[PDB]
A paper describes a structure:
HER3 (ErbB3), which had long been neglected, has emerged as a key oncogene, regulating the activity of other receptors and being involved in progression and tumor escape in multiple types of cancer. Here, the selection of DARPins targeting extracellular domain 4 of HER3 (HER3d4) is described. The DARPin D5 epitope comprises HER3d4 residues 568–577.
In the monoclinic setting the structure comprises two complexes that are related by a twofold noncrystallographic symmetry (NCS) axis running almost parallel to the crystallographic c axis (0.13° tilt between the NCS and unit-cell axes). A comparison of the lattices revealed that the packings are almost identical. Indeed, superposition of NCS-related chains within each of the crystal forms P21 and P212121 revealed root-mean-square deviations (r.m.s.d.s) for all atoms of 0.164 Å (1554 atoms) and 0.304 Å (1657 atoms), respectively. The L86Q framework mutation positions the hydrophilic Gln86 side chain between the Val574 and Leu575 side chains, where it forms hydrogen bonds to the HER3d4 main-chain atoms Gly573 O and Leu575 N, thus explaining its selection.
Numbering used by the authors:
A (entry chain A): 11 to 136
B (entry chain B): 481 to 611
Amino acid sequence: GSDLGKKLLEAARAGQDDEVRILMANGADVNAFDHNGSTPLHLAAAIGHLEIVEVLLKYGADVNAEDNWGNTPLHQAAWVGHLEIVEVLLKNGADVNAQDKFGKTAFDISIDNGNEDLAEILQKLN
Amino acid sequence: CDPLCSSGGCWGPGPGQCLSCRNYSRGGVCVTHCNFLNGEPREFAHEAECFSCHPECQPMEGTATCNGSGSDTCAQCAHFRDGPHCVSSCPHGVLGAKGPIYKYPDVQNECRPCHENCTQGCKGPELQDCL
């Protein structure tokens, strides 16, 4: 599952949806991480692949996993403006008030970037 | 005893049932050699044990594919390279120390920085290359 976890990180990184599904079916470590602390869920959240996010969550991905800087996948999704991914992470138990290395939540990030829709979603969902 | 067990002896006739190996071992099973030059996955050795090369190392023919398990010890990257690491794809806004990192692959499949003001990625280094 360790060799498959390395392959899983690369498939999630490149947005290879089918590859991720095949790798999870073979038992790849869903909580594996690369040299940046980024797990497959962090990588999927950055590229905007909603189906990969859901596949990893179905196979037991830690929705509150932190990278080398203390960032959760919710922080990654908010930083790049992926609203539907933010909504799916919130539905699967993401801590809405998780703070990054500057004490900021997904809400503070959305406000700092002027994303009014993201801030509104975060307010209404929590 | 299996012929791959050392002079010492074994606890069963199988390759994975020796007390010590004559040459190499893959997951406790004695082997004649690691997948250095041929076979899958490609491997390197450490203390007479076979370990897999990172899946992003380009499998080399007639020469070693890697000298360690990290994506930074490949003889060549199968797809793209970001700094010292062989990666399947250049960053697509993955968080780094100061926020999202966006890069584009050059002619030599090396990940180069996007311009400071690109928010959806880039296809080159200039501001007009954003997206």
